[PDB]
Design a binder for this molecule. Structure first.
Ligand code: NA
Length: 253
């Protein structure tokens, strides 16, 4: 692997790695309480034999620049972070894959950037949601204080998340956990759109998901394909991420 740096629109440095390969160029976008290490730890990276893989740390996570503000974590800023990565590698076609909120980011990049030929969203849908302000603030306070890492570790352990997803939380600065949570009030509630007719859009979730309806809504509205994995909840579906990677490799082949 090689390391790279690019700059987002607002000046924030975005750091990542490039894993060279002769196949399709794939850009991987992690979730909120995660960083770029989850791709190897989950087995997703190993499931792509040929792809040229670009994996970024989103702002405020991993080796990327600090933010520390709610508006700095708006969805539109994360989209700008990903588009900067597309610029550096100079291709006309990319395939994006995102986990949880990273899937929502990938779908929004697809809506606005004509270089995105494929976008896959793992355990996140594309529909408008209602985001209650009081619930957001309650979660931000929970995750940003001295007890915030223990709060998240206990939450994810009790919900059966894979060990890599439990452990990633303690690698995120408490202040960025709080700010990213508040950033949800700056545009993430709106639905995402199809960027162009030839794009391939894929949603993935647990067959047991308690709220499959918004996934079916994206099939209809966006012409997206829906993939299911054997799991009773979205958090437990993360145990199937390498399996999903094998099916992604089949599309890229
Ligand atoms: Na990533």
């Amino acid at each position: 692997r090689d390391v790279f740096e690019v700059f987002s629109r607002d000046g924030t440095p975005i750091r990542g790695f490039s894993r060279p390969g002769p196949g399709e160029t794939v850009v991987l976008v992690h979730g909120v309480a995660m960083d770029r290490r989850i791709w190897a730890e989950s087995g997703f990276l190993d499931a792509l034999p040929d792809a040229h893989v670009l994996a970024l740390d989103l702002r405020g996570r991993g080796e990327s620049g600090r933010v520390g503000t709610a508006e700095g974590h708006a969805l539109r800023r994360y989209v700008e972070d990903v588009r900067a990565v597309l610029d550096r590698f100079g291709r006309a076609r990319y395939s994006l894959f995102g986990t949880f909120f990273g899937g929502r980011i990938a779908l929004q990049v697809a809506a606005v950037d004509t270089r995105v030929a494929r976008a896959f969203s793992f355990c996140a849908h594309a529909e408008q949601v209602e985001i209650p302000e009081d619930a957001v603030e309650e979660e931000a306070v929970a995750v940003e204080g001295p007890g915030g890492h223990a709060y998240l570790r206990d939450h994810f352990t009790g919900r059966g998340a894979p060990p890599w997803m439990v452990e990633a939380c303690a690698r995120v600065d408490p202040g960025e956990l709080g700010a990213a949570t508040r950033g949800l009030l700056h545009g993430s509630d709106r639905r995402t759109e199809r960027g162009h007719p030839d794009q391939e859009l894929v949603l993935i979730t647990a067959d047991g998901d308690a709220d499959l309806a918004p996934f079916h809504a994206g099939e209809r509205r966006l012409g997206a394909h829906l993939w299911l994995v054997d799991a009773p909840t979205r958090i437990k579906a993360a145990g199937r991420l390498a399996e999903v990677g094998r099916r992604v490799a089949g599309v890229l082949a």
